[PDB]
Structure 1
Amino acid sequence: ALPRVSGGHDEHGHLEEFRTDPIGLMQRVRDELGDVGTFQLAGKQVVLLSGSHANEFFFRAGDDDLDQAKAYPFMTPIFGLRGEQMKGHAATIEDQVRRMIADWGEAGEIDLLDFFAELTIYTSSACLIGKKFRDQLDGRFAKLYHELERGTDPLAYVDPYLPIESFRRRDEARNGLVALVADIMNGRIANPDRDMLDVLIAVKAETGTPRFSADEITGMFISMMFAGHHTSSGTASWTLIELMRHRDAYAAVIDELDELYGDGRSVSFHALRQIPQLENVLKETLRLHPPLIILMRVAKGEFEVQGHRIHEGDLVAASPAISNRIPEDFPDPHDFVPARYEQPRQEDLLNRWTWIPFGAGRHRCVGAAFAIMQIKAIFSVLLREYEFEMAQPPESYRNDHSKMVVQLAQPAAVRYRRR
């Protein structure tokens, strides 16, 4: 029997705690057991790995050893990048941001979750599907997509179809998205530049009838946008929050942006090049607030890690939330220190197996370049156009960890004023 963390005396073991304070649970696993420890998620044992040694095993393991295929049961009901194009995407993102703030005026107040959740729906759809498709979208799409993400309660590890309100809303939201897509398809029929939707609409089945239904197309689009939406949305929100919490960093970023853009080149040029201060703020934001706090796998065989035996069928997990703060690897792990990424320390590069907001090894984030470029493009526009201030106590900004998809809790109010 592998070492088991304390508690977990509820009906589904540690499931209830996982649904309320997953980070505290995972930290207790490490504090009590070390690099290899377990907790019970309903009828499934989760082997939580942490530390460089254990993480190296996790990230260097291929599909034949650790598989992600059936590690996330909450996604089944929901589903149903090249540098060459990066310059174009940067310009697209700049355009989407300018469109989102077009009605801001001289001063006002926004809720970060509402703002960035909607903005990232537009940037994601425009870049991945096409500008033509994004132009046929409005706030409704973002609202429905949010419901999908809110439908990821860990109870899915018991059963993804339990009769609970969040799952009911998840299913209703997906039907709503199918209807929006169907409306767009019908709109193109009556009122005819092409995008991915046009490509799918054109395919015919072995009978002359359209191959893909609105439902199938919607599932494809939902899946294409799922990796980058909540992650980019949360990262943008927390980047702004930490800049406001640390005015010295904010000031340094502003001076840097004003100096860099002084060469007269566009955001599509600069968002693909170094913006030092902002990049380090982003790295530190990701270390402290990793959008994915836990990564899951299903063991396909028997492996030994530090004397601990892992058997086939076992759920195996790594945690950016916990690993990103190991005190031995990151001096003063709970403090916001962008300087830890400067050439002298480079703590992100030095800790290859523990600085994992973007994963590592064979599972390196393929969208990281795009995500970093997006943050650079977004803030190149926002910070040069407006000044931001917190509208609530600095310590009151927090994440909601009740669903597998972590999202900012409300309120998250910020005030702006033209520069």
Structure 2
Amino acid sequence: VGEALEYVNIGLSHFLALPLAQRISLIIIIPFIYNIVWQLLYSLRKDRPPLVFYWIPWVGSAVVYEMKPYEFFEECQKKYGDIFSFVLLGRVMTVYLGPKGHEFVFNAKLADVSAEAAYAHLTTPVFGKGVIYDCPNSRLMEQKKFVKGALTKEAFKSYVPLIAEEVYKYFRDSKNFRLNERTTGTIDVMVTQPEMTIFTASRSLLGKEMRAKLDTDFAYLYSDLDKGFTPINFVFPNLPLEHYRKRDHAQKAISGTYMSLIKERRKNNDIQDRDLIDSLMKNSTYKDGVKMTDQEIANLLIGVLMGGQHTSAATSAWILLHLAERPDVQQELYEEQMRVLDGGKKELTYDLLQEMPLLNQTIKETLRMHHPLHSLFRKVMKDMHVPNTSYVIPAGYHVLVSPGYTHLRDEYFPNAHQFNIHRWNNDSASSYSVGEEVDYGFGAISKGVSSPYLPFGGGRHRCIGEHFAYCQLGVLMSIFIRTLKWHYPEGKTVPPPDFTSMVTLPTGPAKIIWEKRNPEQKIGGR
């Protein structure tokens, strides 16, 4: 025995004396073997959900997950059922599929899980400090309350003609259209929709000054900030590269522009009820009496515009793409436009938008087939027991929920891979509570989150943008339909999603051919 402890020591010294080749080689081959041994041992644990096997340590199942998450989830679901874990770039993600998963994660106790712990790197570098996920949850709840106060039915009545003006100006002035000069053309929807989206959301939420800025070199800062919104931040939120410097600069420059306007409006008492800026200036004092700073207000503006930017632009791109191979649906939507707007003799209003059920069902169905966020998650802060199981999810794990996956299951949506707006007949609401409501600080919302359709999530982190998105998308699509027909280049069809970006946008280039329904129609203005 004593002779063996000596040879331990001897073995240590010989190990350290190995050639620099073998030692390097051992450096990688040792934790490769340990990783594999640990997993086999982990599988013996009956209080842990099954863990997807993987070869490369740290990296885990990152490649297959990020490239086709729904295919990954379905294969895992077959082998293990609805609850399973996988390693993702240093983290352990526990996935809970289906409505019970929704309930488990979206309705989890505030003390059990943290969204800001999961997300703050995806957002704080882009938006700025003090808001969204760079603040306690109770602060987020009131920020959501503040933003929601600019998102009223009255606001939407005022936004609808502004959004319409931007769409028509885009049709008139953009090189992608020029409808006064050209009667047919080809566009990349991943070019047009981001532009139309920022033009319409700027004009309505930020106001005319901020909209005007986008006609200048200033627009390039939005591009820079936009490029700083990437899943890469999930791993590398700060790296000494030019990319990261333009982002940080952009955030500074853009928040500075918003603060400049804010300070001017106050130093002119020019504070009204026009836009989200006026609203936050009048209404951004927390319940404990602390006021948001001008910097925090500006940062909150950036976050709200950036969030609405990517979800919405992706969604209208998908709407155009699905309709491009469905002239029957374009036709049905057009007849509804003619009926509700009296053959075009009525001006579009917010109230008339609500009387367009097929148009709204089209948005609704697009959001079913294309949830812009395939995976939502939280960091586990306290050990969680999974009801009706012996599973315990340890703190330090992350939980992942994917309502978009359930959107595409035949059990909940018959022929789920078929685009059919009529599956929503007499059910054209963006969403609704089928029962009890609860209020987390930004208004009463559904207490239950068991709906198999959950494009806007649920619980305390639920979206507050849904009515703005439908308003924006509704106006945009109403004008598209009334103005244009469109179709695919020969042999093209709906592209597959790119699941590696922040949202699940179409893989580009995604081109459609438009043509004017009324070639002689002119769009006025200078």
TM-score scaled by structure 1?
0.84
1:207: which partner in 2?
none
2:359: which partner in 1?
278
Instruction: Answer yes or no: is 1:115 the counterpart of 2:192.
Output: yes
* Structure-2 change in CA distance of 1:62 and 1:172 (3 Å): same
1:205: which partner in 2?
none
Task: Output the CA distance in 2 between the equivalents of 1:406 and 1:142.
Answer: 24
Q: Is the 8 A contact 2:337 2:478 kept in 1?
A: yes
Deviations 1:211-248 (A, max 9, x none): 978x7665343112122110111111111111112222
Aligned partner of 1:309 among 384, 392, 395: 392
Q: Is the 8 A contact 2:118 2:377 kept in 1?
A: yes
1:12: which partner in 2?
59
**Matched letter for residue 107 of structure 1:** T
2:160: which partner in 1?
90
Q: Which has the higher contact order (CA 8 A, sep 6+)?
A: 1
Task: Output the CA distance in 2 between the equivalents of 1:77 and 1:392.
Answer: 43
Instruction: Answer yes or no: is 1:326 the counterpart of 2:425.
Output: no
Task: Output the CA distance in 1 between the equivalents of 2:204 and 2:416.
Answer: 35
Instruction: Answer yes or no: is 1:68 the counterpart of 2:149.
Output: no
* Structure-2 change in CA distance of 1:143 and 1:107 (3 Å): farther
Task: Output the CA distance in 1 between the equivalents of 2:428 and 2:197.
Answer: 32
The secondary structure found in structure 2 opposite 1:76 is helix
Query: How far is the alpha carbon of 1:287 from its aligned partner?
Result: 0.8
Query: How far is the alpha carbon of 1:251 from its aligned partner?
Result: 1.3
The secondary structure found in structure 2 opposite 1:316 is strand
Equivalences for 1:11-50 in 2 at 5 Å?
A: 11-50=58-97
Query: How far is the alpha carbon of 1:252 from its aligned partner?
Result: 0.8
Segment of structure 1 superposing worse, 244-253 or 393-402 = 393-402
Aligned partner of 1:231 among 288, 291, 311: 311
The secondary structure found in structure 1 opposite 2:172 is coil
The secondary structure found in structure 1 opposite 2:455 is coil
Query: How far is the alpha carbon of 1:45 from its aligned partner?
Result: 0.7
Query: How far is the alpha carbon of 1:136 from its aligned partner?
Result: 2.7
Deviations 1:292-327 (A, max 9, x none): 111111223232224122222321111133121122
Q: Is the 8 A contact 2:321 2:494 kept in 1?
A: no
**Matched letter for residue 225 of structure 1:** L
Query: How far is the alpha carbon of 1:169 from its aligned partner?
Result: 5.5
Instruction: Answer yes or no: is 1:79 the counterpart of 2:160.
Output: no
Equivalences for 1:115-134 in 2 at 5 Å?
A: 115-134=192-211
* CA-based RMSD: 3.6
Number of corresponding residues: 409
TM-score scaled by structure 2?
0.68
Segment of structure 1 superposing worse, 142-151 or 341-350 = 341-350
**Considering only CA atoms, is the larger Rg found in Structure 1 or Structure 2?**
2
Query: How far is the alpha carbon of 1:281 from its aligned partner?
Result: 1.7
The secondary structure found in structure 2 opposite 1:101 is helix
Equivalences for 1:3-402 in 2 at 5 Å?
A: 3-7=50-54, 9=56, 11-72=58-119, 73-80=121-128, 81-103=151-173, 104-105=178-179, 106-138=183-215, 144-162=221-239, 167=244, 170-171=247-248, 173-174=250-251, 177=254, 219-262=299-342, 264-305=345-386, 306-307=388-389, 308-343=391-426, 352-391=450-489, 393-395=491-493, 397-402=495-500
Deviations 1:127-170 (A, max 9, x none): 22222321232275555435444434444333312456764654
**Matched letter for residue 277 of structure 1:** L
- The percent of aligned pairs where both chains have the same amino acid is 30
Deviations 1:47-76 (A, max 9, x none): 111112221222222433332112112212
Task: Output the CA distance in 1 between the equivalents of 2:332 and 2:513.
Answer: 20
* Structure-2 change in CA distance of 1:157 and 1:224 (3 Å): closer
Q: Is the 8 A contact 1:12 1:41 kept in 2?
A: yes
Task: Output the CA distance in 1 between the equivalents of 2:216 and 2:109.
Answer: 40
**Matched letter for residue 159 of structure 2:** H
Segment of structure 1 superposing worse, 390-399 or 69-78 = 390-399
Query: How far is the alpha carbon of 1:279 from its aligned partner?
Result: 1.7
Query: How far is the alpha carbon of 1:181 from its aligned partner?
Result: 5.9
* Structure-2 change in CA distance of 1:344 and 1:93 (3 Å): closer
Q: Is the 8 A contact 1:300 1:313 kept in 2?
A: yes
Deviations 1:324-360 (A, max 9, x none): 1122111112111222212399997789532111213
Q: Is the 8 A contact 2:83 2:96 kept in 1?
A: yes
Query: How far is the alpha carbon of 1:15 from its aligned partner?
Result: 2.4
Q: Is the 8 A contact 1:390 1:414 kept in 2?
A: yes
Segment of structure 1 superposing worse, 11-20 or 282-291 = 11-20
**Matched letter for residue 96 of structure 2:** L
Deviations 1:104-141 (A, max 9, x none): 22232222122111111122222222223212322755
Instruction: Answer yes or no: is 1:413 the counterpart of 2:508.
Output: no
Q: Is the 8 A contact 1:116 1:233 kept in 2?
A: yes
Query: How far is the alpha carbon of 1:16 from its aligned partner?
Result: 3.2
Task: Output the CA distance in 2 between the equivalents of 1:152 and 1:196.
Answer: 22
* Structure-2 change in CA distance of 1:125 and 1:312 (3 Å): same
Segment of structure 1 superposing worse, 302-311 or 173-182 = 173-182
Task: Output the CA distance in 2 between the equivalents of 1:332 and 1:366.
Answer: 30
**Which 5+ residue runs of structure 2 have no aligned equivalent?**
1-47, 129-150, 283-291, 435-448, 518-526
Task: Output the CA distance in 1 between the equivalents of 2:510 and 2:332.
Answer: 24
* Structure-2 change in CA distance of 1:364 and 1:77 (3 Å): closer
Q: Is the 8 A contact 1:66 1:297 kept in 2?
A: yes
Task: Output the CA distance in 2 between the equivalents of 1:68 and 1:236.
Answer: 27
Task: Output the CA distance in 2 between the equivalents of 1:252 and 1:196.
Answer: 35
* Structure-2 change in CA distance of 1:120 and 1:285 (3 Å): same
* Structure-2 change in CA distance of 1:30 and 1:261 (3 Å): same
The secondary structure found in structure 1 opposite 2:422 is helix
Query: How far is the alpha carbon of 1:97 from its aligned partner?
Result: 0.9
The secondary structure found in structure 2 opposite 1:274 is coil
**Which 5+ residue runs of structure 1 have no aligned equivalent?**
203-210
